[PDB]
């Protein structure tokens, strides 16, 4: 137990398809907020929270006791935790990837035993360049190291191109998957203006992964704003049509010029923004479509208990 991937479907530990419907939380930048943000996100109906961690590369490192704390908060609030290291974002450097891999191995004791509730997203947006082969080489190399260190979680691998070059997955995703000796790896696309700018683009980018029988989440995405087009309506409707997961960016704490992407005015989620209301209450949003992982209800799938 726990998560596993078969074709384009992610299954929870009870064999039930699990379609992520949730929210990114920039924990690494606002470490003290966990015990507030995590329940608030759960209160919006998210079944999954993606937790931004730092290995010390660009921000303050999240230590092993912090990792245990956020996992426990996610579990207590009945959300799947997608944990991710954010410091190699946009880096081609294998060294920067290796620091993220070493971090997961370092923190393994916080992760082993939580394979039914935690999914490891190896590195946010590793490999900034617009190609697939060198991106694939990185994961082919490091995935076996994660396995041999004893991590049996479903692994999640971001597309190249800062998450916006999904052709990387279309072309080399199978090669990456095949290098996992546990055959338990899924992929993620980040849909902003390059990978999610219109309906056609959203649908083609999804199809090019899932039609390869590879499992997918839209692990970050935004929305249309003055500066730019992102088609959040098609991300939500087409994800619901296809059983593709998605995780909106982000609960709170964007820089000033990107604060149109904050879902909530407050850490405690009492005052959603227009964007928050679209994600939570709007068409195909969390309230309409999010179902909890069945691991969080311990009823043994309706088994009748013997009479006493
Ligand atoms: Na009895």
UniProtKB/TrEMBL annotation:
Q: Where is the Glycoside hydrolase family domain?
A: 12-255
UniProt name for this protein? Beta-mannanase
Sorted UniProt keywords: Glycosidase, Hydrolase, Membrane, Transmembrane, Transmembrane helix
From which organism does this entry originate? Bacillus sp. N16-5
Q: Could you say which protein family the record assigns here? A: Belongs to the glycosyl hydrolase 5 (cellulase A) family.
Identify the EC number(s).
3.2.1.78
The superkingdom listed in its UniProt entry is Bacteria
Output the GO biological process annotations, alphabetical, semicolon-separated.
Answer: glucan catabolic process
One GO term in the molecular function aspect is: beta-mannosidase activity
């Amino acid at each position: 137990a726990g998560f596993y991937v078969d074709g384009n479907t992610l299954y929870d530990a009870n064999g039930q398809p699990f379609v992520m419907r949730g929210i990114n939380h920039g924990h690494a930048w606002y470490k003290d907020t966990a015990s507030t943000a995590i329940p608030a996100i759960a209160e919006q109906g998210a079944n999954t929270i993606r937790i931004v961690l730092s290995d010390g590369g660009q921000w303050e490192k999240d230590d092993i006791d912090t990792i245990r704390e956020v996992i426990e908060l996610a579990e207590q609030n009945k959300m799947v935790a997608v944990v991710e290291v954010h410091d190699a974002t946009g880096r081609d450097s294998r060294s920067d990837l290796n620091r993220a891999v070493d971090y997961w191995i370092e923190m393994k004791d916080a992760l082993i035993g939580k394979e039914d509730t935690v999914i490891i997203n190896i590195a946010n947006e590793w490999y900034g360049s617009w190609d697939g082969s060198a991106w694939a080489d990185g994961y082919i190399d490091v995935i076996p190291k994660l396995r041999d260190a004893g991590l049996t979680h479903t692994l999640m691998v971001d597309a190249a191109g800062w998450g916006q070059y999904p052709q990387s997955i279309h072309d080399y995703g199978q090669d990456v998957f095949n290098a996992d000796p546990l055959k338990n790896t899924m992929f993620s696309i980040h849909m902003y203006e390059y990978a999610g700018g219109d309906a056609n683009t959203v649908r083609s980018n999804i199809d090019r992964v899932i039609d390869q029988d590879l499992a997918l989440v839209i692990g970050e995405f935004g929305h249309r704003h003055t500066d730019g087009d992102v088609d959040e309506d098609t991300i939500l409707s087409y994800s619901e049509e296809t059983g593709t997961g998605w995780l909106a960016w982000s609960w709170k704490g964007n820089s000033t010029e990107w604060d149109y992407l904050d879902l909530s005015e407050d850490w405690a989620g009492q005052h959603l923004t227009d964007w928050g209301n679209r994600i939570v209450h709007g068409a195909d949003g969390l309230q309409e479509t999010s179902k909890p992982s069945t691991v969080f209800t311990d009823d043994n799938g309706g088994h009748p208990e013997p009479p006493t």
